[PDB]
Design a protein around this nucleic acid. Structure first.
Ligand code: AGS
Ligand code: AGS
Ligand code: MG
Ligand code: MG
Ligand code: ZN
Ligand code: ZN
Lengths: 657, 623
DNA sequence: TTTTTTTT
């Protein structure tokens, strides 16, 4: 009959230690108490969420032990039974809660406005969470220290979904995985307040279950004093509320055992942390892993078997300031950052440095422009690679996809045109047609890589025509007439008809693409493979070194690290330069010259398709991107001539023969 | 005293301040708050805006008062009441409505005007506040925002048929028949335990007589969050806002409307059998006011002045797409389609809509898609889509629950429609479009679902020649390669070509480069332009003219003599009608017909079109 | 069964 069990824990001692830590602990080694400082901000209502770092707890424990204490090993303790300790920390915060400083934010807070009133009428009465306005949280232990070592068996180590074991229930844990889907935020009440006129008393029902039943009667004294039976009424204003959202994390294919379907865990998020996540993005999350109780009837149906979920204390993203600023001036002072980055791209790959340069220009992307009249011209840049097989094209695209923070990789056959752009699922639930974000949607504000683009269906090719020239995606499918912004960059890989280019065939014929499609690309690269004894030797030596030593042969070159390129690329993209009139004259003359060339150069041998205004816009985008790299406030004629050189090289690669 | 619970907002002081804001509130307060001291007009500004509105409202006898935020923010007494409303709307609005009712009563009695004070006492006067707050992204909403007015913008996805909204409960005794009415407080009924008559006081004999009870009218509308508000990350959300009272059935589908309303959340029964409620709460909004997306005598004067300008035709043509370089003829054609012809709904022979249908087939990179985007932006009822992303079912009508979903065309009925990449759009869906545009109506024939629907709307198609670049070697018809019936269905077809004209290329490059120069770069005010087009459509009604009809007969005879389908005749007729409308003419003229034929030849490039071979000389095209 | 994107 509920037999008592002795356990080596005293919640009173642990609470005292927690209070001593909060009031005492300061980030002096890093540098009033930092925790007391946070509580002071909370009193100022500056912050409504509190994060208690387990590493800070460990530091405090180390300090106490070095001093010599009957340490309660709180940092370890929180892991075993996290929720009760979170409640204890919240209570301690309230106990050590400092008074308001500066000006308090209760200018119109109904709680503060009426809570005191309620007290004056009265002159735990009400649930502590009702007054509490701070969302408690816990930062996961930093694995770098792993001072627990023997104790740190895998605590910080993120674990796949299947890696999770019922033993971990009630314990803080870390998981790495992609967010399959995210629900829309919804409100939830920590406390429900009913108001009845007969009493004039505002009872405070507190609910922690998934569902609750209304009181529908007054236990309030005033109704009891008169013997009256109260008709309680819900008061949303009085009742406390919190935001809630739900997210599902699924196992990574790498984590997934061969022949095993990925497992997904439902994630509950509340308070400030809500909306922090983003669907389809790799993330490492740490939080309390708890069972999910049932409804009474479904509970009886299920019995001892229980649903389980995760409540995320903290979120870490593998990818998305002054430190950044210094890091970038380092490379800026190094100079030649443009060519240095181009070489740094695909360190594995040998040669094709011009291709790498163009890829970098695409990565930064051209300036997106909107006109006062309302015109908007796509600033994104799209490049096509049309070359003989086995020239590392696919490798290059995969490298770029990894490089870009939001990049997504795709193949034409494996991806449906509808799925590539967007899919209408007839029956997610109740057989209600729903639009599904396609690969392009996933690539929004990112780069989408399409291989075998020639093998891609022509109809789906026309489908992507809209998105690539025009950012938005308009869908009028059955039951769904909607538009999606769908701003993203496109990189396509394909090979000449019959596999490899035929010199006898015209460049356009070997390309075998719609002229509308061709023009919509800002650039097409006709990289070709010809046997060159010396060049073959050089490439073979490079590849052999790469095999022998995983690092590519240095070749008197230094390659910047991926995080560094992404940081610098973001900074450069922030520029948005504006070009000048001399550049206008130069580019206008060049465009006129090119159009005249095409108007005379229809010959199949040298025919690459007629020049179009889209070509001029792409040239302008490339010049603006070059300025972004150079970080200049205005585009320079140097950038224009460089872009012209890039295009001329792309076309002349064949002419060189 | 009278205070609002939990707010310290004195209802008495609130009433006094709002009263002083009702009378003794000069519009000068508002304009000064908006500064614009260069635009202050004594009459308007010195006028007690709200007193004049109340007088005109009594004259109209309506019980609804539209109200901006800025007026409250302009009156020092009601400046605080503005924030009070923002924080605790419902109570503030109730007090404010009572104050308006009392002020109207005072006005009639104070002015000793011969008016039924009972009517005003019977008139449930309401205030429809708008502009309460800066339009915030709906997705941005969070729980604490509940119980506050949230200015919102969106598109009406769908609306429910009005629902009986229980208003006051009516009971009756089952032993002595004595009856009582229980007003619905907080959406619930507190039934009398025993008969109201203490003589009977029979327990549970009081029964609610549904029919005898009082009900109100409620409707709910799904409103999509505008793409501007939403991020690229995810699809736009929608909210099924609950509308009530006259506001019910005050908007169709596809209505770009901005609405102010209180943010509302409610529990939801976890188990219908039980009273257990899910911890999470269903959330909705009660719109206190709705904004859709009168031509003042000054506006009419400006309209007629612009009509006086001879450049009116070309001026509007350039104004519709100011950024676009050149293409004046295409601009003029689409301008005419925006104007539309005359809808002479014959009592017999069916209706004859003056609709205009323009397809754009030509070599790509020509901004055709950009032009479509402009047209969609301009038309108040716009429907933009692409064939590839479009389905015939979703284009016109989609079965649902048994219930039907309006298609893109349905969302354009009475407006302009845009179908991008029309050539790519499937031939089957093309056939679907054929009859609907031909009859301006959607005919439905399905198992259990067989009917017809109004589809009176213009469509602006964008196509590309079968040869990616229009091939003059191929005849124009072969270059387009579209069904001859469908080809006839369209009224105008502009064959845009990218002729390599070094001069034109220079000029276009200059235009684009200049645009690039300004980070954020004559023509009518698009707002004034829309007002012009509207006023023309509603008030002006072109009517065929004797010279016009004779010229039309001769012209179509020539056409058929040179193929000239009867739809060609109707096309030139409706085009001349729309031209006269553009000229604000209620009567057609010979010159309108001449312009119609001229533009017909222009769009097809008949001047450069080869008399035989069905081809066009590129050298002749643009000379 | 009928209507329906979507993939096979
Ligand atoms: N310049 C190079 N540097 C390094 N590896 C190279 C180079 N050229 C070719 N390779 C290698 O040779 C192979 C080339 O084929 P893949 O990279 O698999 O695909 P690809 O055919 O080059 O590109 P496609 O046609 O779009 S599939 C890969 O294993 C590359 O690693
Ligand atoms: N006369 C023009 N004035 C202004 N911009 C133009 C003109 N002709 C072409 N452009 C530009 O050329 C580009 C072509 O955009 P689109 O709208 O796709 O062209 P299009 O005529 O629709 O042909 P498609 O869509 O490729 S079949 C845009 O950047 C336009 O701004
Ligand atoms: Mg490859
Ligand atoms: Mg276009
Ligand atoms: Zn009570
Ligand atoms: Zn009775």
């Amino acid at each position: 009959a509920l037999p008592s069990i002795q356990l080596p824990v005293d919640y009173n001692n642990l609470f005292n230690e927690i209070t001593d830590f909060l009031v005492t602990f300061k980030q002096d080694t890093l540098s009033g108490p930092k925790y007391m400082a946070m509580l002071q901000k909370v009193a100022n209502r500056e912050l409504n969420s509190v994060i208690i770092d387990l590493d800070d707890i460990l530091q405090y424990q180390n300090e106490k032990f070095l001093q010599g204490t009957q340490a309660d090993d709180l940092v370890s303790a929180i892991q075993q039974n996290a929720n009760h300790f979170t409640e204890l920390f919240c209570r301690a915060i309230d106990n050590n809660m400092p008074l308001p400083t500066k000006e308090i934010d209760y200018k119109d807070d109904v709680l503060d406005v009426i809570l005191n009133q309620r007290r004056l009428r009265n002159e735990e009465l009400f649930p502590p969470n009702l007054t509490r306005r701070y969302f408690l949280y816990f930062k996961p232990l930093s694995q770098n220290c792993a001072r627990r070592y023997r104790k740190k068996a895998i605590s910080s180590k993120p674990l796949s979904v299947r890696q999770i074991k019922g033993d971990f229930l009630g314990q803080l844990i870390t998981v790495r995985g992609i967010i399959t889907r995210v629900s829309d935020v919804k409100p939830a009440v920590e406390v429900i307040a009913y108001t009845c006129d007969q009493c004039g008393y505002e009872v405070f029902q507190e609910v922690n279950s998934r569902t609750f039943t209304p009181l529908s009667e007054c236990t309030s004294e005033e109704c009891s004093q008169n013997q009256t039976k109260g008709q309680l009424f819900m008061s949303t204003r009085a009742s406390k509320f919190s935001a809630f959202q739900e997210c599902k994390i699924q196992e990574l294919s790498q984590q997934v055992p061969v022949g095993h379907i990925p497992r997904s865990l439902n994630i509950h998020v509340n308070g400030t942390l809500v909306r922090s996540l983003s669907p389809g993005d790799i993330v490492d999350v740490t939080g309390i892993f708890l069972p999910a109780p049932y409804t009474g009837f479904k509970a009886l149906k299920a019995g001892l078997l229980t649903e389980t979920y995760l409540e995320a204390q903290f979120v870490r993203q593998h990818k998305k300031t002054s430190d950044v600023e210094e890091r970038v001036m380092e490379l800026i002072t190094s100079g030649d950052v443009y060519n240095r980055l181009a070489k740094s791209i695909a360190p594995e790959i040998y040669g094709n440095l011009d291709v790498k340069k163009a890829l970098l220009l695409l990565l930064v992307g051209g300036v997106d422009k909107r006109v006062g009249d309302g015109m908007k011209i796509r600033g994104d840049i799209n490049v096509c690679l049309m070359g003989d097989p086995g020239v590392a094209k696919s490798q290059l695209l995969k490298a770029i996809c990894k490089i870009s923070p939001r990049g997504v990789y795709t193949t034409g056959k494996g991806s449906s045109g509808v799925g590539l752009t967007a899919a209408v699922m007839k029956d997610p639930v109740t057989d209600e047609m729903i639009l599904e974000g396609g690969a392009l949607v996933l690539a929004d504000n990112g780069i989408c890589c399409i291989d075998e683009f020639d093998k891609m269906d022509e109809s789906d090719r026309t489908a992507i025509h809209e998105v690539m020239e025009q950012q938005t995606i308009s869908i009028s499918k059955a039951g769904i007439n909607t538009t999606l912004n769908a701003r993203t960059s496109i990189l396509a890989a394909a090979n000449p008809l019959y596999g490899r280019y035929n010199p006898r065939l015209s460049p356009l014929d070997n390309i075998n693409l719609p002229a509308a499609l061709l023009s919509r690309f800002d650039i097409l690269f006709l990289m070709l493979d010809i046997p060159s004894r010396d060049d073959d030797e050089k490439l073979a030596e490079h590849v052999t070194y790469v095999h022998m030593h995983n690092k590519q042969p240095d070749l008197d070159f230094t390659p910047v690290e991926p995080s560094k390129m992404r940081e610098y690329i973001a900074y450069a993209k922030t520029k948005r330069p504006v070009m000048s009139e001399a550049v206008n004259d130069y580019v206008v003359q060049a465009y006129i010259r090119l159009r005249q060339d095409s108007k005379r150069e229809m010959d199949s041998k040298f025919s690459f398709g007629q020049a179009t205004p889209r070509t001029l816009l792409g040239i302008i985008r490339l010049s603006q991107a070059l300025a972004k790299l150079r970080l200049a406030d205005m585009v320079d004629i140097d950038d224009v001539e460089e872009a012209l050189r890039l295009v001329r090289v792309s076309k002349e690669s064949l002419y060189q023969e | 005293l009278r205070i609002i619970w939990g707010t310290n907002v004195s209802i008495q002081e609130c009433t006094t301040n709002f009263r002083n804001f009702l009378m003794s509130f000069k519009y000068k307060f508002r304009k000064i708050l908006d500064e614009r001291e260069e635009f202050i007009n004594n009459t308007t500004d010195e006028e007690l805006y709200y007193i004049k509105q109340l007088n005109e409202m009594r004259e109209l006898g309506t019980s609804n008062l539209n109200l901006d935020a800025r007026n409250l923010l302009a009156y020092k007494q009601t400046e605080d009441l503005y924030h009070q409303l923002l924080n605790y709307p419902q109570e503030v609005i109730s007090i404010m409505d009572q104050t308006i009712k009392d002020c109207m009563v005072s006005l009639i009695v104070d002015n000793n005007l011969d008016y039924d004070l009972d009517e005003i006492e019977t008139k449930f006067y309401k205030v429809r506040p708008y502009n309460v707050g800066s339009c915030k992204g709906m997705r941005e909403l969070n729980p604490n925002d509940i119980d506050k007015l949230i200015n919102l913008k969106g598109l009406v996805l769908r609306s429910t048929p009005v629902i009986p909204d229980m208003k006051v409960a009516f009971f009756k005794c089952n032993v002595c028949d004595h009856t009582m009415a229980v007003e619905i407080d907080r959406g619930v009924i507190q039934e009398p335990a025993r008969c109201e008559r203490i003589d009977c006081n029979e327990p549970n004999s009081m029964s609610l007589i549904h029919n005898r009870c009082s009900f109100a009218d409620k409707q709910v509308i799904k409103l999509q969050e505008t793409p501007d508000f939403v991020p690229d990350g995810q699809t736009p959300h929608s909210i099924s806002l609950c509308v009530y009272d006259e506001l019910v059935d005050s908007c169709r589908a596809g209505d770009r409307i901005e609405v102010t309303g209180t943010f509302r959340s409610i529990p939801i029964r976890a188990n219908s059998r039980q009273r257990v409620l899910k911890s999470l709460y269903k959330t909705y909004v009660d719109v206190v006011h709705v904004k859709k997306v009168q031509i003042t005598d000054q506006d009419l004067a400006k309209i007629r002045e612009v009509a006086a300008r001879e450049d009116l035709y070309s001026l509007l043509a350039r104004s519709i797409a100011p950024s676009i370089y050149e293409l004046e003829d295409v601009k003029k054609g689409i301008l005419l389609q925006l104007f539309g012809g005359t809808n002479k709904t014959f009592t017999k022979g069916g209706r004859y809509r003056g609709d205009i249908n323009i397809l754009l087939c030509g070599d790509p990179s020509t901004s055709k898609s950009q032009i479509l985007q402009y047209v969609h932006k301009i038309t108040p009822r716009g429907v933009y889509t692409s064939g590839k992303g479009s389905s015939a079912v979703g284009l016109t009508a989609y079965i649902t629950r048994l219930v039907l979903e309006s298609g893109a065309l349905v969302l354009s009925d009475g407006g302009v429609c845009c179908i991008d990449e029309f050539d790519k759009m499937s031939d089957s869906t093309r056939s679907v479009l054929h009859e609907v545009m031909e009859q301006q109506t959607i005919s439905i024939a399905k198992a259990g679902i067989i009917t017809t629907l109004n589809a009176r709307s213009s469509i602006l198609a964008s196509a590309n020649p079968i040869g990616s670049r229009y091939n003059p070697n191929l005849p124009v018809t072969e270059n387009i390669d579209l069904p001859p019936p469908l080809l006839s269905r369209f009224d105008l077809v502009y064959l845009v070509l990218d002729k390599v004209d070094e001069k034109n290329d220079r000029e276009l490059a200059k235009h684009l480069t200049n645009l690039y120069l300004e980070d954020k770069p004559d023509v009518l005010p698009v707002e004034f332009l829309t007002m012009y087009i509207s006023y023309a459509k509603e008030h002006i009604h072109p009517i065929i003219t004797e010279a016009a009809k004779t010229e039309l007969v001769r012209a179509y005879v020539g056409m058929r003599k040179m193929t000239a389908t009867t739809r060609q005749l109707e096309s030139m007729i409706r085009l001349a009608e729309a031209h006269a409308k553009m000229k604000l003419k209620n009567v057609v003229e010979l010159e309108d017909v001449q312009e119609a034929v001229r533009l017909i030849r222009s769009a097809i490039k008949d001047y450069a079109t080869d008399p035989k071979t069905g081809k066009i000389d590129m050298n002749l095209v643009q000379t």
